[PDB]
Scaffold this motif. Structure first.
Motif, mmCIF file in Angstrom:
data_model
loop_
_atom_site.group_PDB
_atom_site.id
_atom_site.type_symbol
_atom_site.label_atom_id
_atom_site.label_comp_id
_atom_site.label_asym_id
_atom_site.label_seq_id
_atom_site.Cartn_x
_atom_site.Cartn_y
_atom_site.Cartn_z
ATOM 1 N N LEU A 179 20.269 -110.721 55.184
ATOM 2 C CA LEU A 179 20.313 -109.369 55.743
ATOM 3 C C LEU A 179 21.575 -108.629 55.303
ATOM 4 N N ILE A 228 21.565 -101.794 49.778
ATOM 5 C CA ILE A 228 21.428 -100.402 50.204
ATOM 6 C C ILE A 228 22.642 -99.595 49.769
ATOM 7 N N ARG A 287 18.896 -93.101 37.379
ATOM 8 C CA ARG A 287 18.912 -93.099 38.864
ATOM 9 C C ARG A 287 17.558 -93.545 39.425
ATOM 10 N N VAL A 288 16.457 -93.003 38.909
ATOM 11 C CA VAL A 288 15.103 -93.257 39.477
ATOM 12 C C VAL A 288 14.769 -94.733 39.284
ATOM 13 N N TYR A 299 14.449 -100.916 45.457
ATOM 14 C CA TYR A 299 13.462 -100.864 46.530
ATOM 15 C C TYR A 299 12.604 -102.123 46.538
ATOM 16 N N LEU A 300 12.135 -102.538 45.360
ATOM 17 C CA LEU A 300 11.352 -103.769 45.275
ATOM 18 C C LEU A 300 12.181 -104.976 45.709
ATOM 19 N N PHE A 321 14.759 -105.008 47.675
ATOM 20 C CA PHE A 321 15.037 -104.927 49.103
ATOM 21 C C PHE A 321 13.831 -105.343 49.926
ATOM 22 N N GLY A 322 12.625 -104.974 49.491
ATOM 23 C CA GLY A 322 11.439 -105.464 50.177
ATOM 24 C C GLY A 322 11.330 -106.976 50.126
ATOM 25 N N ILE A 327 16.874 -97.210 41.545
ATOM 26 C CA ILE A 327 16.431 -97.055 42.962
ATOM 27 C C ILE A 327 15.052 -97.694 43.180
ATOM 28 N N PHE A 352 13.171 -112.321 56.993
ATOM 29 C CA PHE A 352 12.372 -112.355 58.212
ATOM 30 C C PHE A 352 11.514 -113.608 58.335
ATOM 31 N N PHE A 353 10.920 -114.079 57.241
ATOM 32 C CA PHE A 353 9.885 -115.107 57.304
ATOM 33 C C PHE A 353 10.243 -116.298 56.425
ATOM 34 N N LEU A 369 22.513 -93.416 43.408
ATOM 35 C CA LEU A 369 21.880 -92.104 43.517
ATOM 36 C C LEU A 369 22.639 -91.021 42.759
#
Ligand code: CDL
Ligand code: PTY
Ligand code: PTY
Ligand code: PTY
Ligand code: PTY
Lengths: 475, 475
Positions: free
Chosen positions: B448, B455, B326-327, B334-335, B337-338, B330, B345-346, B462
């Motif tokens: 997006l 997500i 799980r950890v 997270y990386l 998703f960033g 996630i 965005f750019f 999780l």
């Protein structure tokens, strides 16, 4: 680099009301068991010590926005801060429960008069551009400093009687009164009339709603008192909206919120304030109970949060003229979500401080500081000077309202997880070690729930159509 | 540091089937307009060139898991890779549409025979522990290398006839055949019978479902052919489940998925494979169309993705014995998703490469590599050696199935945004500059949407209750 002294004094005076409010709230929360021990107050008085302040802070907050317009923004700010200072003076000399309740009510009155006035002054006394960005950064930074300084002061003053913990608001109050008197300049004497009906109805509705919400927990949700207060609050709010529909001077401008940008911004403001308050309360409770830190230790450990939040607010105020409100809020929320994920995954009883607690707090502070400036900068935007006051009051009221709403859900989830893991309910001193790890795991689960709430905040903030041309680009 | 040559040869031979499959898919996608230009194929043949391979890859994939158990895992792997190589040989000498379709069908047959066999061999030939972690990392890394190398080979071979783009699968196929013949050792000759009914029913159901999904777009969703294929697929799947309920040798073990950990892991595998395929296709299409890069340029620009993904897979294989499935999923998500937020965005037309395209690509590759290892490590866990084959086949089939499902939604969203911004539909060469920025904004919106999908993947992951004690801790 080192701006004019007048500008620094002005921004500090404006943020002083927020600093005082959060400082007093944290100090009361810290000192409340001592107050209970000395004055021999029951649970009723224990809840009343905070309910009396919150009632008059939430009830009259919507009134201050129009009050600063009908009498004067500087004058209303001076009156509110002076009332708060005198109320703290009379609170620190209370001899029974009634005097303490009266003092807390008058403190709430002063705070509700003076804080939306400060939020409106941020946009009024500084034209659009770098000045407003710096004022916003100072506003939020001094809110954080007020909270952490209140925690530190309560922890340091815990040993001696609690009556010295309320006298701390007097020197700061006088200092900010003087700063707002000399730094600020009174605008043109364009005084305009106030509709008493709308103000009275909004005050009654907000006060009754706050009374219902605060008396629910203690007096039972299903009792008649809470349901009656909720019903009168709803009726007063409906009547207030009806009067504002045909009001000649709207206390709350309902035609402004037809904008998609403003509505999305205010919804994001509400839910982000809820996330922030839930984070603050949960982290404080965790550090106090599971980690075994005293209040002074908690404050000196949360000082890095203030430092990181100031860094983030400065950074966001610098880039708010280049990058959109949407991009900046989503970037700060990403940092905060990473910090919160680390805190939810790798935090248990006995963890060190430097590596396990300081880092997740510093990253979260940077993210919160980066996300705050664009939000409250988009809140005060595209409105006249005779009309900014209501907008600021509504924004501040939503920010303060969202907090307890999300905090109740998070605390309910934490208690449910504690009971399901096999942890008893009550003071943390009674439960032994087998019931202390359950509380830690429940707190981590609550942090995960706060993470979901922050994801919702970001998904909602994706729709802020505001562009930096109309936030921080002057004329 | 530099493990035994036998181990390296074994892991490379196992991942060779994935490398070959993705390489051939990318090469066909690249070379398909040339194939259309030379063989004078219509849109029917254009779609058939890929549909013929995908049909037999998806239909017979569930059969290979039990095939490796009834005949032998090494033997089935050898047979599948040899069939794929001979099929590529016969594909690169096709003279009409029928020969090309037959070659693609036989390539799909070989791939479906040999890839689930490799996924099962990862868990079979290496006991639990560091060996399985290294095998998993090699598996995923060589999948990525296969994709990027296929893109590069297609771009380099675009100038000359397309018949040379399919001969590239012959030397690699022979190399991996030899590696699997010498490196791998045949296990005990514990051959056990196969239920023909379940295999036939599963093959028919999967083939009919793939046929329906692929013929929908071109022949109309509301036509009779697609609805008939869907109906026969559903009937065959229902009958297959009915037979497996009372099957003496289950091709698909339905009692295994009662576990919450396994079910959550496989659902996360499906949706994560969907996210990965959507990302790959969308980024490739964006780089080809908006940025104006050729296929060779796209491949040499995506090589950093392979490097970063290998780094992430190594890191994840190292920490899979310390940190939970799980950890790790996630953290990688997270990386990713960033990186995807930055890309959404750019990123516009005319952005540089070094700063705007290489960074998000590297961060996303690191995140994907970190998230892949725990997922496919939890997929192959807690199962007998006579029963791992079905689990591996189901995991690979779900990973390949999730892709087009999410890709269809993402492409529909992108096309809708393009049409709403005022961009025409068709080849990118016809539309002018005013219709090219609309495509870029639509692609950012699709990114997006992929972020929202990721997500969802993380929220689902999780719940993976697996602990590193039962993933990478041997006995
Ligand atoms: C609804 C809730 C959604 C669900 C909740 C559950 C999720 C929670 C969680 O922990 O998620 C985990 C986690 C979530 O993280 P994430 O996915 O990165 O997304 C969250 C981001 O980190 C960042 O998310 P974020 O949104 O939280 O951060 C950015 C931003 C935006 O986020 C978004 O963009 C959201 C996206 C849309 C949301 C809808 C999604 C549904 O969000 C914000 O928080 C910004 C808002 C600001 C926060 C508030 C700040 C407080 C300031 C106080 C202000 C006070 C008022 C001032 C004014 C007063 C005047 O998931 C993962 O990371 C794992 C993903 C797995 C991917 C794997 C890919 C591998 C594929 C390879 C193939 C494998 C094959 C296998 C082998 C087979 C053999
Ligand atoms: C709609 C939501 C109804 C909830 C109303 C009150 C909920 C929050 C009450 C509360 O404690 O908020 C304080 C002031 O509220 C405020 O900021 C003003 C809240 C009043 C505005 C909403 C009025 C709606 C009227 C309709 C009634 C609906 C049903 C009534 C139950 C700020 O809290 P803190 O952070 O200072 O300290 C936390 C200590 N709790
Ligand atoms: C206009 C106003 C702008 C909003 C300003 C927000 C500043 C703020 O409130 O933060 C303060 C943090 O206080 C504190 O006591 C610090 C709390 C520490 C939270 C740090 C979060 C980092 C992420 C968590 C990592 C997990 C690791 C530990 C498990 C408390 O603000 P307030 O006025 O809302 O609060 C009221 C006190 N109750
Ligand atoms: C339930 C979902 C029903 C959808 C079935 C097929 C959807 C995906 C088809 C497809 O192209 O997937 C390929 C093979 O499918 C596979 O991996 C096998 C898919 C078949 C398993 C599902 C069988 C369900 C039967 C019930 C029928 C329900 C309604 C039928 C419409 C892998 O794609 P790629 O990545 O190689 O190339 C992408 C080129 N498209
Ligand atoms: C068991 C198997 C484990 C799964 C292995 C996943 C590796 C992978 O699929 O990446 C491959 C390379 O993708 C590529 O061709 C590189 C595409 C670049 C995507 C990098 C993502 C970074 C985030 C984007 C930031 C935005 C910047 C630009 C707007 C394509 O995988 P596949 O075999 O599933 O695909 C099929 C090709 N069609």
């Amino acid at each position: 680099w080192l701006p004019s002294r007048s500008f620094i004094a002005a921004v500090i005076a404006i943020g002083g009301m927020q600093l005082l409010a959060t400082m007093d709230s944290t100090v009361a929360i810290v000192a409340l068991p001592k107050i209970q021990n000395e004055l021999s107050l029951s649970d009723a008085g224990r809840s009343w010590v905070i309910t009396a302040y919150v009632l008059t802070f939430g009830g009259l907050m919507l009134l201050g926005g129009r009050l600063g317009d009908t009498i004067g923004r500087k004058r209303t700010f001076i009156v509110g801060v002076a009332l708060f200072t005198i109320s703290s003076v009379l609170c620190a000399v209370a001899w029974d429960e009634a005097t303490l309740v009266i003092a807390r009510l008058s403190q709430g009155v002063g705070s509700a008069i003076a804080s939306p006035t400060g939020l409106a002054l941020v946009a009024t006394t500084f034209p659009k551009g770098p000045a407003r960005n710096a004022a916003t950064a100072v506003f939020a930074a001094m809110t954080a400093i007020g909270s952490v300084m209140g925690l530190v002061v309560g922890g340091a003053l815990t040993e001696v009687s609690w009556r010295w913990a309320f006298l701390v608001n007097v020197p700061i109050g006088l200092v900010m009164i003087y700063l707002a008197r000399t730094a600020l300049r009174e605008t043109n004497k364009e005084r305009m009339k106030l509709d008493a009906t709308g103000a009275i109805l909004a005050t009654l509705a907000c006060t009754a709603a706050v009374f219902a919400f605060s008396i629910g927990p203690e007096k039972g949700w299903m009792s008649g008192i809470t349901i009656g207060s909720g019903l009168v609050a709803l009726a007063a709010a409906v009547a207030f909206v009806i009067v504002e529909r045909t009001a000649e001077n709207p206390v709350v401008p309902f035609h402004l919120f037809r904008d998609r940008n403003r509505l999305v911004t205010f919804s994001a403001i509400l839910l982000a304030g809820g996330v922030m308050f839930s984070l603050t309360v949960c982290i404080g409770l965790y550090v106090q109970d599971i980690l075994g830190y005293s209040a002074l230790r908690a404050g000196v450990g949360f000082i890095p949060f203030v430092i990181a939040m100031g860094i983030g607010l400065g950074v966001s105020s610098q880039l708010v003229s280049r990058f959109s409100p949407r991009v900046l809020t989503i970037g700060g929320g990403y940092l905060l979500f990473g910090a919160m994920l680390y805190g939810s995954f790798f935090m248990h009883r006995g963890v060190p401080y430097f590596p396990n607690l300081v880092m997740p707090i510093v990253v979260g502070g940077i993210g919160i500081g980066m996300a705050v400036v664009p939000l409250t900068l988009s809140a005060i935007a595209g409105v006249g000077f005779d009309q900014i006051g209501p907008v600021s009051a509504i924004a501040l009221m939503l920010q303060s309202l969202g907090g307890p709403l999300v905090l109740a859900v998070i605390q309910a989830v934490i208690t449910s997880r504690t009971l399901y893991l096999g942890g008893t309910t009550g003071p943390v001193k009674f439960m032994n070690d087998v019931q202390l790890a359950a509380l830690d795991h429940a707190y981590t689960y609550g942090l995960l729930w706060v993470a979901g709430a922050a994801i919702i905040v970001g998904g909602m903030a994706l729709f802020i159509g505001y562009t930096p041309q109309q936030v921080a680009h002057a004329q």
